[PDB]
Amino acid sequence: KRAALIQNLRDSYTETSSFAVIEEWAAGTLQEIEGIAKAAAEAHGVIRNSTYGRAQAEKSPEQLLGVLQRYQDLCHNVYCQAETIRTVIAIRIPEHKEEDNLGVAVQHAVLKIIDELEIKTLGSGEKSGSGGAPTPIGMYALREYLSARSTVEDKLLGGGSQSPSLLLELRQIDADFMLKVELATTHLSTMVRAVINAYLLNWKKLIQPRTGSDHMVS
């Protein structure tokens, strides 16, 4: 039974599933994000006040790793929560037609901002489109940091490099990565706030995009 298959999907991902995500985002998520932004500003201040030597190439800074980890964990949760809302909407896109698509237009408009949250803001894909990657840093922040820093560490440790700018670069990778987190959390907050508004204003047509019954006919 085809209707039962559809009804099973919709009963397991209801308006309550996507609403619960929006409630979670309005409260705890925005506050966690702000927390990470402060942690990164704090860690950033410490790096600016530091003279680097060779010893800084022999150890990876645990404070920066902790911030990056926190950011990655948050991005993970938000991505998974974003997919709940996409599911709720996507299993309610109605029969394809060339008419009565005003509520369908709402569905696609909100799906598109969520995709932007996931794809552009969170940088969750393996490869960015030709529109590039507009977020200061993405989901795989730790990997990106470790990869950039190891390269410079190797050159410095070797005889290691004589280059004065290369040692300064080790520090700049540390500083810029904390800065990128500050910028990305700020940017992600805007996006999370835009989605909350877009959901709550449009939710009825998200669930019920067509309002049927023939009043002109019998």
Binding site: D214, M216, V217, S218
Partner: protein
């Protein structure tokens, strides 16, 4: 795109706006007609919507005169306008000649009015199909008529959402010259077969006419016997 204006043919020679009008007709309540021994009848299902609605009213079956009745499906206000047209057109013939010799000419006048609204810019077609049934100087008559002004004469037929289920039932179960009570029974059964999965017939409208008589409209407790 060839489907936005009634006066525009598609490359294949189709008038899509007229085809869309006949979609409106597919959404109405099911009705049927059938000829029986020396007569014809009509039955109509009514989409009852609430106990606050006065049910004696806005009937699906409308007498055009004492010997001719119609039932419509589709746009309700369009259909009311066509029933008014049919009534006045019936009276004009009767005044001109003293009587209405052949019901087919009445149906053709109605269908001609509908054909007009598929040929001139600035109008839309009527979103309506009708069945006409009655007795003329030829005998018992049953016709339908669609938004294009296409007409056919039948032994049995149906219109509205259950049309396809009703017609297939009649195709295998219909027989000519049934006594009135057996025609009605079959008609009721034909209508019941169009209803979805454990649904129930809520007393339809029924009307019939036999040779030498005027139309009779079955009352509530008369229709009740058949359910």
């Amino acid at each position: 795109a060839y489907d936005r204006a009634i006066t525009v043919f598609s490359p294949d020679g189709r008038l899509f706006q007229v085809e869309y009008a006949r979609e409106a007709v597919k959404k109405g309540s099911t009705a049927l007609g059938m000829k029986f021994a020396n007569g014809v009848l009509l039955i109509s299902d009514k989409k009852v919507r609430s106990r606050l609605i006065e049910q004696n009213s806005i009937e699906k079956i409308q007498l055009i005169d004492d010997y001719v009745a119609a039932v419509t499906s589709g746009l309700v206000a369009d259909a009311r306008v066509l029933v008014d047209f049919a009534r006045i057109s019936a009276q004009q013939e009767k005044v001109t000649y003293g009587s209405l010799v052949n019901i087919e000419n009445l149906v053709k006048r109605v269908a001609d009015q509908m054909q007009q609204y598929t040929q001139y810019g600035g109008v839309r077609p009527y979103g309506v199909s009708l069945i006409f049934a009655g007795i003329d100087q030829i005998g018992p008559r049953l016709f339908d008529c669609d938004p294009a002004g296409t007409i056919n004469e039948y032994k049995a037929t149906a219109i509205g959402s259950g049309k396809d289920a009703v017609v297939s039932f009649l195709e295998r179960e219909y027989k000519e010259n049934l006594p009135e009570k057996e025609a009605v029974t079959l008609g009721i059964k034909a209508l019941k077969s169009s209803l979805e999965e454990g649904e129930e017939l809520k007393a339809p409208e029924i009307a019939s006419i036999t040779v030498g008589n005027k139309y009779r409209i079955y009352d509530q407790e008369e229709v009740k016997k058949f359910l």
